Amino acid sequence: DIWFEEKLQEVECEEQRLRKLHAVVETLVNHRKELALNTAQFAKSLAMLGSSEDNTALSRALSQLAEVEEKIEQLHQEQANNDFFLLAELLSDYIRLLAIVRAAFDQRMKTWQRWQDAQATLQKKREAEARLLWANKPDKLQQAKDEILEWESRVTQYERDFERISTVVRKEVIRFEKEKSKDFKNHVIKYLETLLYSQQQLAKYWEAFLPEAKAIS
């Protein structure tokens, strides 16, 4: 009916909006990982500097700085991965979920056409019956008519087939909307503590460096 045409237009347009958001993360994950390398490689340069130095107080803190960035590229590495396995794969699998209803809605009208494919051959048996009813032969009178009542129930059979598939996808859609409400609040929190742990560990890293900078005398 119309509710089935409804829950197909927006979903196409929603899955489109859903697919357009997954593209950013795949580049964001690529960007942070690129920065993790651009951080450890940068740390690998602040160490050779602190090594190639005549002053002692600076050479001490310079190494103590190059070590800090090596702790950040790991925090960066964990960040991008926890952005991929926990957010990107959270997406790439939900559009996969939307692909199931795209097959169910396909399967729903694959059953409707099956019903019409039964009504397509039903009008033939009555049409063929109209010919064997006029000209003189009693054989095909008791042959095609037996096939009439057969497909007459087949178009009834496929009709009730189409009715029930139309219903199971309604229960299938509602099965999502409740599971989305109770889980997304948690699923969006499950991702934020990673940023929280990163920020806390980020802060917990710089406050440990500050005394190592005052120690320069």
């Binding site: 909006r17 958001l21 940068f42 002053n55 600076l58 934020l192 406050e207 900078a213």
Partner: protein, 182 residues
């Protein structure tokens, strides 16, 4: 006095690995604004998600859309601040070392004038004995001003990264526990 030869032999390696740390610093700040640009490239596609979304879920989502707009600015602070304290401090001692290395060449220009006039004048001696003192002081003064600046630039940012990280903590926690108890 081998002080001038070894410092020159120190001026060649420290310049080469400072330049290395400089180009790697800008890359770290370049690769940072890239992610910072994506935080506003994310909310652009994130706001367009609640365009056709349930009523109760629309509010659950848009509150984090405002969050990402704030996080785009904070990440813009660190990417810019690191270019003022790392690369710029690293860039400053690429040009002054380039000028400090130019100071020894003139001392040789008074030293070969010392050797040219010795195989025969005191103006090639009074100038060198002044250059072996004026440049001797302008070079040691360049150290204490560099060690202090290296200690200062490392201090200003450690107090900044503390505020930045503690800010974002006071920004994410304003949203996590807002969802733990909706």
């Amino acid at each position: 006095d081998d002080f001038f030869e070894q410092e020159k032999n120190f001026l060649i390696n420290y310049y080469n690995r400072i330049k290395d740390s400089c180009v790697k610093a800008d890359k770290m700040t370049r690769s940072h604004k890239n992610v910072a640009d994506d935080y506003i490239h994310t909310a652009a596609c994130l706001h367009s998600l609640a365009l056709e979304e349930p009523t109760v879920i629309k509010k659950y989502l848009l509150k984090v859309a405002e969050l990402f707009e704030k996080l785009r600015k904070v990440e813009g602070r660190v990417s810019s601040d690191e270019d003022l304290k790392l690369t710029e401090l690293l860039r400053y001692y690429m040009l002054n070392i380039e000028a400090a290395k130019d100071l020894l060449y003139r001392r040789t220009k008074a030293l070969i004038d010392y050797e040219n006039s010795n195989k025969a004048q005191q103006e090639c001696c009074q100038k060198f004995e002044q250059l072996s003192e004026s440049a001797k002081e302008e070079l040691i003064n360049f150290k204490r001003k560099r060690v202090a600046a290296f200690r200062k630039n490392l201090i200003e940012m450690s107090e900044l990264e503390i505020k930045h990280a503690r800010n974002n903590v006071s920004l994410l926690q304003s949203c996590i526990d807002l969802f733990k108890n909706n």
